Amino acid sequence: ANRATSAFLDNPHPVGVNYVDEGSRQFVAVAELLASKLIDSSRESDESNSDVPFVQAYSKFADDNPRHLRVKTGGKMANALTNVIRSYYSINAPAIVPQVEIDRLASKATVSGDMYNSYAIFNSVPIVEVLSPARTTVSIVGSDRADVTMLNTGAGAANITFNFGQIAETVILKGSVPFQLARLNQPMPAARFTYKLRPLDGPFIVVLPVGNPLVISATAATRIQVPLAFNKALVESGFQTAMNDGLFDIQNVNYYSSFDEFIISQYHAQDGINRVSTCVILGLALQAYDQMRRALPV
């Protein structure tokens, strides 16, 4: 019996247990709001010929006036946002920022830090385990689109068990050639190209005929509660910037290609429910980090 798993699902590292209170959540939402105005100030600077819209927005963000002498960094808000991101990723990262500073920064804007007033769709495909007989070879490749390649070399047909977890809402299976998939203790259906499955129903058996290889492409959709100001495009860009900037460089952690893989991997832990809440706050902070660092690159 050969057991094949998705690469990104293994060994999820613990996330930080800090900056998840109401005051800290308001700080991240304030940072997202003020970083959004900072980007918009550039366009409002172009309609006129002055830099007053940008100077006005920088002073609100950084509590200090911009100066031509030095590189515009972001002031106290930039340091707080950078350090808070590090504490979110790993529990080993220190909680450097004091709560007094966070409370002061949270009073700049009148936003409410409610992180459960919307939802987002996450396309990572969770394949917990694919169990195959001795003669068959199974290879799972990819996260956004899982290409499972299976070859049967034995005399007779083989039955392959698919376990997609108990978190994903829907999983769509498309095969190169028509194939038969049925749930355990259910009669095999005729060969079809496309199967739509609900992962909660149970493990699925796939019949592998002897001959040419069969490749199955899987796409999954998962709904996770997120703040209304969530922007998936902006969050993904911030994740790449934080990874490049070294915000995630800390011992005994796991690295992921995208925020889609990160949140799904944490959700599929032993107690993944409590990790998702922290991960969502990290995404909102990453969204603010992307907007702020693009306006003020260092």
Partner: peptide, 8 residues
């Protein structure tokens, strides 16, 4: 608290 503190 300088920020708004709710009863949630």
């Amino acid at each position: 608290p300088a920020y708004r503190l709710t009863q949630s």
